């Protein structure tokens, strides 16, 4: 029903000279784009990844991201110079940006930044800010980032206008792959376990039944991905009943 669009950026700064930035883009649990440090251009991972943008609109946007990648890299390096010797390499920076699409024309946009695997900064409203628990030395980098009115105006435009616009088109163009059903296949095993693989979408029901009565003991594992964009699940502890949207009332009972 509700799809979260996220551009996930991974930037590593080993030392003063070495750095790489790699990004992946998701619409729900489906990868739509990949942008490797090695590549000058953003790659589509779905036939519908350009959404409803024109080739010219896609190109203008890509050009912006290309300038951003080179500029962000130098800005982090200059911020490390500014903070020395307090903060030094190796440095890991993760950026999560995108928007959630709700019923109607409702949307909520986000831009969260993690430093050394800890969420410290977000872009909120018209400027950058630190979040509760962030170290106080980040106030000088935030002051400097907020001095850049040009980047702030661009970010506001991307979050408030571009992200919702793009994702509405993406949801249209990708409707068939997002609303696709894939039947789960289940098998039992136990060593001194209910394996369920190949289902899509992610929402599933897996339970250990003593006839009609359920068992409180049964431990549903984490959702493990398959390389063909389907899911894998385990249920540990007599019959294994699995209920999925693809089965349409015909539940799987494995004794």
């Amino acid at each position, epitope marked *: 029903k509700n799809y979260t669009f996220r551009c996930l950026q991974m930037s590593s700064f080993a030392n003063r000279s070495w750095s790489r930035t790699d990004s992946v883009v998701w619409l729900g649990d489906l990868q739509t784009h990949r942008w490797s440090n090695d590549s000058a251009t953003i790659s589509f991972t779905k036939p519908w990844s350009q959404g409803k943008l024109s080739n010219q609109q896609w190109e203008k946007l890509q050009h912006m991201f290309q*300038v951003y990648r080179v*500029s962000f890299t*130098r*800005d982090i390096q*200059e*911020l490390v*110079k*500014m903070m*020395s010797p307090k903060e030094d390499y190796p440095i890991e920076i993760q950026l999560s940006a995108g928007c959630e699409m709700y019923p109607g024309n409702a949307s909520e946009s986000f831009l969260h930044v993690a430093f050394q695997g800890k969420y410290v900064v977000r872009f909120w409203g018209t400027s950058w800010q630190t979040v509760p628990g962030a170290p106080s030395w980040l106030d000088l980098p935030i*002051k*400097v*980032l907020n*001095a*850049d*009115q*040009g*980047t702030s105006a661009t970010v506001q435009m991307l979050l408030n206008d571009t992200c919702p616009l793009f994702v509405r088109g993406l949801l249209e163009a990708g409707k068939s792959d997002l609303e696709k059903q894939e039947k789960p296949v289940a098998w039992l095993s136990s060593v001194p376990v209910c394996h369920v693989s190949g289902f899509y979408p992610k929402p599933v029901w897996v339970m250990w039944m003593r006839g009609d009565q359920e068992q409180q003991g049964t431990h549903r594992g984490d959702f493990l991905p398959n390389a063909d964009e389907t899911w894998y699940l385990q249920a540990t502890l007599l019959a294994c009943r699995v209920k999925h949207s693809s089965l349409g009332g015909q539940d799987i009972i494995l004794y």
Partner: T-cell receptor
């Protein structure tokens, strides 16, 4: 927002030590050293993001920088060469893109 | 160099207008500043241009900026003897102290009194 430099002109000898000083009372964290030569625009030698910090610019070779305090930023020429005959400019700024330039220092390095 | 100025030098008579050009390849181009430098003296800011298509005015000085064309023009209306100086074009690649200034080599203007 003003920047002062000392001395205004300086005559030094090859292999001698030259210290060009720059002072600002604007409480600016960032300070920059440039040299101006005919046929060229100003070129960044060294800069500083605060007291204790020095960063290499585009053309650092032959120069050493010292930021002993927020106010003072020095350009040290340990072994003056005649190629270092130039006009040296100092600038300062806060978190903004504006750099406030100093009046200059004409250095002449003789044999 | 990433910043080129034209003409290299020019001679005008008092009361005449001077038109000075700047072209750059600096990426990104946050802002463009024009400086006036008198012989022996330092740099005095004449104007800053910040928008995609910008126009500024400061008395007898006026300027334009077209970030798409990566070009700027400085106009001196009714030049005076005191306008004898070097006019320097500078492109800043960030809207904060994180930026580097890219300097043009200047245009020498001589005004005949």
């Amino acid at each position: 927002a003003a920047v002062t430099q000392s001395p205004r002109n300086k005559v030094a000898v090859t292999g001698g030590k030259v210290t060009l000083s720059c002072n600002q009372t604007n409480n600016h964290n960032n300070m920059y050293w440039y040299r101006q030569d005919t046929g060229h625009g100003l070129r960044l030698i060294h800069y500083s993001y605060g007291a204790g910090s020095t960063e290499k610019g585009d053309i650092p070779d032959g120069y050493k920088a010292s930021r002993p305090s927020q106010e003072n930023f020095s350009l040290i020429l340990e072994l003056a060469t005649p190629s270092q005959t130039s006009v040296y400019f100092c600038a300062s700024g806060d978190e903004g893109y504006t750099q406030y330039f100093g009046p200059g220092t004409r250095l002449l390095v003789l044999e | 160099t990433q910043v080129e100025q034209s003409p290299q030098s020019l001679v005008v008579r008092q009361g005449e207008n001077s038109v000075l050009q700047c072209n750059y390849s600096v990426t990104p181009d946050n802002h463009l500043r024009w400086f006036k430098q008198d012989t022996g003296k330092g740099l005095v800011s004449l104007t800053v241009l910040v928008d995609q298509k910008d126009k500024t005015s400061n008395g007898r000085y006026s300027a334009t900026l077209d970030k798409d064309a990566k070009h700027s023009t400085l106009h001196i209306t009714a030049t005076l003897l005191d306008d004898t100086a070097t006019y320097i074009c500078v492109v800043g690649d960030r809207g904060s102290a994180l930026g580097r200034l890219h300097f043009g080599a200047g245009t020498q203007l001589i005004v005949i009194p």
